[PDB]
Specification:
The structure is cut from a larger assembly and holds two copies of chain A, two copies of chain B, two copies of chain C and one copy of chain D (about 70 residues). With about 50 residues, chain A is an alpha+beta fold. Chain A contains two helices and two strands. The radius of gyration of chain A is 17 Å and the shape is flat. Chain C has a two-stranded parallel sheet. In chain C, strand 1, helix 2 and strand 2 form a beta-alpha-beta unit. Classes of the chains: A alpha+beta (about 50), B alpha+beta (about 220), C mainly alpha (about 50), D mainly alpha (about 70). Strand 2 of chain A pairs antiparallel with strand 11 of chain F, so a sheet runs across the interface. Chain C: Belongs to the RNA polymerase beta' chain family.
Chain lengths: ~50, ~220, ~50, ~70, ~50, ~230, ~220
């Protein structure tokens, strides 16, 4: 179902995209996984620990 | 005796963004100028974002103004991307005055002679009462890069972050050209995405101005 | 953990990549081949080492 | 600049006398008032002390010679 | 007050002075080591990776 | 909103007490950051005690862990609502779902050692767009103790300090609503008789922020100052 | 708004004449890589220079071959002829000779002078001859080009490394100013083949690049 939903998008099937390095400006070998992950911030911030 | 690139065509595909073309290029300078111009255009372009909003009846950025459906802070995050162009100044104080039930879009701003809002459909907040009206003073100033609210330097002055960057997304593609019985040349096509406040010729010219200025260090 | 993955990716070989079976005068033009893109990072090559 | 002290161990083999000898010498340069024998690189007196150990002109014997000599003088 | 001249003073008292880093459950004698500081615009100790 | 959810987000964000669930469905009469006024349909409406519904939202007040519980309206003016729907998104809620963090574009590659053991590397886009920028609220007490040798005054007449201390106070000695203090500034002037020693409340070191609210409590038997 | 922090190089800590180590401090935040790459791909791949392209042997018309008198094979002799660094005057191409007999190493000095061909490293060992009657003789062709052109892209087809550099690298380390937060310190490190000093090959790298930006500024 994820593969067919990616087929509905204009995206590659394996979920991996060739990416270009920001510093050097050239294609990474072995195309990398990208996507959207839901990420959280915890209240163990650093300006309480210092 | 390398060849030299020139701006051969600026196809304005939309009012927001456009594609310029750098052509011709010797084999190897395509990714050099593509990465370098991408990096300069994302890093350092002169922008015109909002800096310091001063609503009238509002003491601090955490209170609420009576009769607007949004908080003052979501008004700050709506004004943070108020894309505006200025021409002959550096700072300027805009003024928004709007009453009546309905949305308060960017067109409700005083239209002073050089200051031009580039996106009139941009919502700020919604008014909701008959006799209720926000009345703020908006301070737009020029800048460069990203200046957060902490690292700068009465009480009604609410300080927002500065987001001085006209461009948003750069992409470039090298491909071949067919100049005069001579293959293995390169056509750079720089597809930028601008919020609407910098013309692409001005961007692609100021960028090489910055890079060639940086090469003064040893030539 | 990352650094042994980078070294293990750096010193291996595939049987057919660019620069297969060409001789190289030193490690310096091996760096100069890989930074350009005429060779691959792992393709077998006779070199002269000291 | 000083990264390791392997040369100092190769001149003073104990590695536990190195801290005592170099500490004594660094006292003789800091609040001892004396001037160093190797040119400093805007360093603190510790790196000057170990830096003089690795040259071969400071150990416990030289400090015995100098302190007994000033005890005579 | 954190004036402007104290930071060159601070770079002139760091330069060759070790500090001791310590992770809290110290098991073996490598649990306390000693480094030299490099000043960080930040709020986090930047530790060498292999160490 | 979470892109990849479960469907238990609706039951958590509704069934906890942070959203303003409409008790009776109808037509929204008025939308404000402070309050939401709901006109009721005719079917679920009592004959006596008929009226309409008025929801007072909870604005910026302190949580138990120094985070900022907040309620914001998620309906607009003139909109049909149904019994059992959300009207105010609470903290970490959006349109009735439960949305704890934010969802971002992630790559999986070892990038120059800046993600060595388990680290994370975040671009300037995320910090520019103000999207992990959490709002904290700290509560600083300053009591007026009756001790030996004399009672404590809350006056502004403080020795050893100049106009940098008294610039941000009124004549009573308490900081203004919204005067943006930093670390080291004086919020509440307070001296203890010894001539007299400074014991004023000071902002703890290393924090910034804006004084959003000032509570004043007074023992029955002390006359009030002007600011109270 | 327009005034950046234009640097100038504070030191050239150079080891022996083909080696150099150029710092540049300070550069505005992010300009370490937009110059460290732009000088990398211009020095490495597109530099004007002259080097050996093809060699033909008097009695050998095959790559995988053999010859008496010289113990290092013809497969092994071309590695020395790659590193044979020759600076040439305005001739676009010129051919050279290596007619020599004897016992011992044949260095680069044993080529005839022959006008514009200058040998910057005469001591570079090309081949050893071990017999008293062994005699080596070949035609070797230098040529003017603009970067690494290999043998498989193009008598013996030898790799053509016209570019005067061999190693370039850069390490952007941080470098503070008085009250600035963090900036860059471009550390350019370069080793050439000896046809040009490495203080100048950087100053030809910016020379090529500033010409490329001429229709813009």
């Amino acid at each position: 179902e994820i593969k067919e939903l990616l087929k509905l998008g204009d995206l590659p099937t394996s979920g991996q995209i060739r990416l270009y390095d920001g510093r050097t400006g050239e294609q990474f070998e072995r195309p990398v996984t990208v996507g959207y992950m839901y990420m959280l911030k915890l209240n163990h911030l650093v300006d309480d620990k210092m | 005796e390398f060849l030299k690139p020139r701006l051969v065509d600026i196809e304005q595909v939309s009012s927001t963004h456009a594609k310029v073309t750098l052509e011709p290029l010797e084999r190897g300078f395509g990714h050099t100028l593509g990465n370098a111009l991408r990096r300069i255009l994302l890093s350092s372009m002169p922008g015109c974002a909002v800096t310091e909003v001063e609503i009238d009846g509002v003491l601090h950025e955490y209170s609420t103004k009576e009769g607007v459906q949004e908080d003052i802070l979501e008004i700050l995050l709506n004004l943070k991307g108020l894309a505006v162009r200025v021409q002959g100044k550096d700072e300027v104080i805009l003024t928004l005055n709007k009453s009546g039930i309905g949305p308060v879009t960017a067109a409700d701003i005083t239209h002073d002679g050089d200051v031009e809002i580039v996106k009139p459909q941009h919502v700020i907040c919604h008014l909701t009462d008959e006799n209720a009206s926000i009345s703020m003073r908006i301070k737009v100033q020029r800048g460069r890069g990203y200046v957060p609210a902490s690292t700068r330097i009465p009480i009604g002055r609410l300080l927002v972050d500065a987001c001085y960057s006209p461009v948003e997304r750069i992409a470039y593609n090298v491909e071949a050209a067919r100049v005069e019985q001579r293959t293995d040349l390169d056509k750079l096509v720089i597809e930028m995405e601008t919020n609407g406040t910098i013309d692409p010729e001005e961007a692609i010219r100021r960028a090489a101005t910055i890079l060639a200025e940086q090469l003064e260090a040893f030539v | 953990q990352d650094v042994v993955l980078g070294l293990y990716y750096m010193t291996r070989d595939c049987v057919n990549a660019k620069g297969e079976g060409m001789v190289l005068t030193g490690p310096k033009e091996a760096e100069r081949l890989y930074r350009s893109g005429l060779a691959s990072l792992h393709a077998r090559v006779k070199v002269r080492i000291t | 600049a000083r990264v390791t002290v392997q040369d100092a161990v190769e001149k003073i083999g104990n590695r536990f006398d190195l801290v005592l000898v170099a500490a004594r010498r660094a006292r003789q340069m800091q609040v001892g008032g004396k001037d160093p024998l190797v040119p400093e690189e805007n360093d603190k007196t510790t790196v000057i002390a170990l830096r003089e150990i690795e040259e071969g002109l400071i150990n416990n014997q030289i400090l015995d010679v100098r302190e007994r000599q000033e005890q005579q003088e | 007050r954190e004036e402007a001249v104290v930071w060159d003073i601070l770079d002139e008292v760091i330069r060759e002075h070790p500090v001791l880093l310590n992770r809290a459950p110290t098991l073996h004698r490598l649990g306390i080591q000693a480094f030299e500081p490099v000043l960080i615009e930040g709020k986090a100790i930047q530790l060498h990776p292999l160490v | 909103k979470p892109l990849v959810g479960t469907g238990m987000e609706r039951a958590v964000a509704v069934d906890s007490g942070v959203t303003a669930v409409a008790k009776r469905g109808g037509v929204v009469q008025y939308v404000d950051a402070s309050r939401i006024v709901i006109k009721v349909n005719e079917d679920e409406m009592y004959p006596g005690e008929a009226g309409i519904d008025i929801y007072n939202l909870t604005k910026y007040t302190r949580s138990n862990q120094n985070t900022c519980i907040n309620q914001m309206p998620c309906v607009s003016l003139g909109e049909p609502v149904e019994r059992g729907d959300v009207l105010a998104d609470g903290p970490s809620t959006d349109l009735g779902e439960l949305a704890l963090g934010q969802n971002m574009r992630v790559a999986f590659m070892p990038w120059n050692g800046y993600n060595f053991e388990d680290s994370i590397l975040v671009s300037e886009r995320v910090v520019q767009e103000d999207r992990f920028t959490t709002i904290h609220i700290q509560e600083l007490a300053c009591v007026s103790r009756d001790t030996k040798l004399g009672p404590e005054e809350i006056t502004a007449d403080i020795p050893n300090v100049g106009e940098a201390a008294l610039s941000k106070l009124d004549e009573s000695g308490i900081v203004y609503i919204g005067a943006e203090v930093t670390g080291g500034d004086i919020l509440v002037g307070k001296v203890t008789p010894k001539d007299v020693k400074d014991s004023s409340l000071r902002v703890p070191n290393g924090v910034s922020g804006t004084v959003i609210d000032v509570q004043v409590f007074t023992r029955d038997g002390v006359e009030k100052d002007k600011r109270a």
